């Protein structure tokens with residue numbers, strides 16, 4: 001039901017896909033779906049599809065949910081949480097008012113949704129979703145409805161994972177396409193993220209600021225009596241103080257694992273009631289949400305209720321999840337409790353109901369991906385092989401890690417070794433750190449003109465640095481997991497510390513899960529993901545068979561990763577060996 005392929009990185013990954021997935025494609029009616037995580041990857045796919053469009057016929061359109069593609073809803077209202085359901089009701093009512101006679105109701109709903117001009121743009125130019133949104137904006141035509149209008153005559157579709165893996169959304173999506181999950185083919189772009197996408201989509205949380213929000217909604221819409229003497233506002237106060245007492249009492253320096261029944265226990269003891277009562281009041285809150293939703297709708301607002309969406313998430317929290325999820329409490333962002341999905345096999349399972357094709361270029365040992373993802377498929381290493389002498393991977397002793405976030409002494413060795421390498425190699429380097437504290441500690445010990453990448457991010461200032469990166473000079477600092485992971489220019493990578501997952505309660509839980517299941521919690525929850533994080537930087541450094549680069553790791557326990565990286569070396573003088581490597585590269 002699936003195939004996993006590995007291509008050496010860059011400009012090819014998605015061309016190879018249709019070149020390895022014209023198999024089936026259209027001889028058995030099938031539709032080609034392209035799932036993508038970030039919008040940055042989306043366009044790296046679409047740019048490829050655009051190139052091959054002149055080769056032979058392909059009719060593609062990007063597809064995304066109203067949550068992204070509805071223009072109106074951000075002007076009419078602006079909520080801090082939202083969902084596809086509420087936007088459905090909202091929009092359907094607007095379309096009613098337009099079709100009834102009030103075109104102003106929603107000025108983006110008109111003939112242009114079905115016009116040749118619009119459909120020409122979608123197929124002949126094949127924009128990204130962000131690009132087709134902009135088109136729609138300037139042309140006063142709804143992007144979403146346009147996509148859905150163009151969909152039934154589309155052979156190929158490029159959508160986010162979070163769109164399709166939303167069960168209720170996928171059903172409407174396919175009901176309009178005409179295709180069924182039998183008649184589909186799904187290409188999983190950068191499928192090395194599949195495990196993480198599952199755990200992400202699967203998880204949910206109830207945060208204090210979310211209760212705060214429902215509290216204001218409660219006051220807005222009557223704050224009626226749920227029980228005789230307990231109002232909506234009172235119930236919310238009960239639920240927030242359960243959470244706050246839990247965060248106060250249960251956790252210190254950060255996250256903590258708790259048991260799901262604990263919240264209800266805290267709920268029961270504090271307020272002197274049993275489950276029946278608390279379950280009921282929680283239900284009566286969801287019902288109030290339903291009232292709020294109806295009341296917002298009949299006015300013309302987006303019918304989204306914080307009390308409705310909170311009610312369900314608490315019910316969901318307290319009810320299921322004991323085996324495949326973990327109950328994490330957290331002090332962050334006022335506090336929240338979370339259902340951390342530890343095993344994404346059950347979320348991703350819906351995919352093997354269609355034919356899947358797992359594209360990456362970075363999932364070295366497949367067993368881990370198969371065991372984690374729960375995908376029992378063949379694995380082929382389809383990719384014309386780049387020579388190993390064109391690459392240089394090595395790890396270094398000096399900066400010996402007895403602790404993972406301590407020792408000023410061994411942090412000086414981190415600064416010096418870096419400074420020796422960059423000043424001597426003199427090439428376009430980016431130094432990934434495992435955290436912001438180590439990067440900030442190193443930067444003030446270091447004394448060379450570099451380029452920061454601190455929290456805040458914002459899309460505009462990311463390019464301002466990227467402009468000066470490609471053009472002149474060289475060095476850039478970044479935290480590994482950050483947004484420099486989304487991209488000639490590059491040449492050397494200095495992993496200033498091996499990018500392990502943080503001492504989370506979640507990562508602790510994941511270890512336990514893959515300890516109780518395979519007796520290898522370390523290999524499954526720490527190493528394999530870290531190896532795949534590394535390989536990715538190595539992969540984004542060398543994309544061509546004629547491109548060159550180096551990648552050092554400053555870590556004493558980096559030796560582990562030889563069986564994941566079969567051409568890694570070890571160094572005691574990395575500065576000189578990398579320089580000696582680059583002299584050998586220049587030669588040719």
Ligand code: SF4
Nearest residue numbers: 070071072091106142
């Ligand atoms: S037609 Fe209007 S209400 Fe519907 S998704 Fe488009 S902008 Fe939103």
Ligand SMILES: [Ca+2]
Nearest residue numbers: 085290293308
């Ligand atoms: Ca509802």
